[PDB]
Structure 1
Amino acid sequence: SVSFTFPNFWSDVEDSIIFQGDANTTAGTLQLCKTNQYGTPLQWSAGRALYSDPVQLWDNKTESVASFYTEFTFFLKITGNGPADGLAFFLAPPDSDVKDAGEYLGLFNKSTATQPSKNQVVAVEFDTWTNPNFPEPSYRHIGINVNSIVSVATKRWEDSDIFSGKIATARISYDGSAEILTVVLSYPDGSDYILSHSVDMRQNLPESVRVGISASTGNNQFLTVYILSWRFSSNL
């Protein structure tokens, strides 16, 4: 029963948005991590923007899982060749706070990343990191995660797009009936990515959630992520 539209971020914004970590607005943009005055991205930073109004994912009683659609556009301002880590759209309990930086995208802690029982987060990640010592695919990719840093579904994200210097459009939908989460990543280039997989929102998250977007940086300082717009709609 929640829907919102942010054509950009020049409005006040802090009514409807909750900023965690480095998260802040920057020129009608949503900037998740912080940068120098010389515009260089700070190391090991995490940031998340959450919509201030909770969403009914499921209802114990009247029993069924909500369906929702979300859309947002972003830009990967990349300088060097070690872009990391990226961003993610996610759902979490209303009181969730930012987590670890690095490949955790401020969604997971270093120690319990793989233990589903100790987590409250379902997300769609857009990863540009390439750390082999981390649970794979091991290459830059788009993935769906359910209370774990090891994705149930992954789709490779070609560098030609990642470093395109173009605005990408992310479309995430969830059919709370067929319980299928779909992710479509579009580039004006025409190139698109479609990723779909089963997710049980009832078994992994509480009845009420907060929807948000987060980013994090690691060692390198070659990446800055900007969210230019974000729309959302849910129905239970």
Structure 2
Amino acid sequence: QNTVNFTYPDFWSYSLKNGTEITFLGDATRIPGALQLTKTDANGNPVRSSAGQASYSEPVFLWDSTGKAASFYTSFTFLLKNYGAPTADGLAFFLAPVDSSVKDYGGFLGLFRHETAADPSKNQVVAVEFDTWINKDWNDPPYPHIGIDVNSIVSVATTRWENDDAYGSSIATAHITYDARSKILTVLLSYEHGRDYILSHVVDLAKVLPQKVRIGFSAGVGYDEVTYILSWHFFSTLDGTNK
């Protein structure tokens, strides 16, 4: 079939072989209960200048020449543990070509290399970033933000992420949806007894990504932080695109 549907309610079954279900790249490791994205020393304390990626092993069908295009929805809970405020650099949910890998650390979030990050013609990646650091270089807005990145680290759209959420170290739940008929990407971020964050933008994936992609989480530090992914669900559907 052309669609995907998986659900990991938690990651307490930390025993599967790298590359069978989830592939860990760079400094991303599987620990009991979580996908850890960047490096920590013996005490779980975050190491500076590190990048890692945890991505689903099977290729994910996005679109085909015949007009079939997948709509999708992914939800995940994560803990961006902070060791002070502010911290750097954040994490990202992404869709990239199957052959790609982790790139630069820090503000590039393991997704871009320094020399081509602001060039949309040299990159093929769509990402939803949870950026804890204002890099003026890449035109980050003057606060922690959530952003939608299309082929570049300069977001096509961002919304404010409050300091206390961004550096508060609480578990957060994210829902990211893509409607393939209207070409809309929506991000919803919720904190249990807190506020929600909404960011939606029109982006046609068929025009920016190959027909089949790898999906996953990418992180880049920075300092005083480490992101843990606690659960992951993904569902894609061809509904409404003639199949």
Residue pair 1:65, 1:201 contacting (<8 A) in 2 also: no
Deviation at 1:165, TM superposition (A): 2.9
Aligned to 1:95: 99
- Across the two proteins, how many residue pairs are aligned to each other? 233
Residue pair 1:64, 1:176 contacting (<8 A) in 2 also: no
CA distance in 2, matches of 1:207, 1:232: 18
- For residues 167-199 of structure 1, the C-alpha deviation after alignment (integer angstroms, 9 at most, x for no partner) is 100110000000000000000023100110011
- For residues 59-103 of structure 1, the C-alpha deviation after alignment (integer angstroms, 9 at most, x for no partner) is 112x14210000000112111223111111000111111010011
Q: Where do 1:30-179 residues align within 5 Å?
A: 30-61=35-66, 63-179=67-183
Uncovered stretches (5+) of structure 2, i.e. residues with no partner: 239-243
Uncovered stretches (5+) of structure 1, i.e. residues with no partner: none
CA distance in 2, matches of 1:64, 1:158: 39
Deviation at 1:134, TM superposition (A): 3.2
CA distance in 1, matches of 2:198, 2:57: 29
CA distance in 2, matches of 1:136, 1:35: 26
CA distance in 2, matches of 1:103, 1:65: 32
Deviation at 1:40, TM superposition (A): 2.2
Q: TM-score, normalised by structure 2?
A: 0.92
CA distance in 2, matches of 1:39, 1:52: 26
Residue pair 2:6, 2:233 contacting (<8 A) in 1 also: yes
Q: Secondary structure at the match of 1:136?
A: coil
CA distance in 2, matches of 1:24, 1:113: 25
Q: Percent identity, aligned pairs only?
A: 59
CA distance in 2, matches of 1:64, 1:190: 39
Residue pair 2:37, 2:218 contacting (<8 A) in 1 also: yes
Residue pair 1:180, 1:197 contacting (<8 A) in 2 also: yes
Letter in 1 for 2:103: K
Residue pair 1:64, 1:177 contacting (<8 A) in 2 also: no
Residue pair 1:75, 1:165 contacting (<8 A) in 2 also: yes
Deviation at 1:136, TM superposition (A): 2.2
Letter in 2 for 1:55: V
Letter in 1 for 2:5: S
Residue pair 2:108, 2:153 contacting (<8 A) in 1 also: yes
Q: 1:188 and 2:192 equivalent?
A: yes
Q: TM-score, normalised by structure 1?
A: 0.95
Letter in 2 for 1:233: F
Letter in 2 for 1:2: V
Q: Secondary structure at the match of 2:143?
A: coil
Aligned to 1:19: 24
CA distance in 1, matches of 2:122, 2:5: 29
Deviation at 1:138, TM superposition (A): 3.2
CA distance in 1, matches of 2:163, 2:143: 10
Note the aligned Cα RMSD (angstroms).
Answer: 1.2
Residue pair 1:57, 1:208 contacting (<8 A) in 2 also: yes
Residue pair 2:84, 2:167 contacting (<8 A) in 1 also: no
1:9 to 5, 11, 14: 11
Runs of 4+ in 1 over 6 A off after TM superposition: none
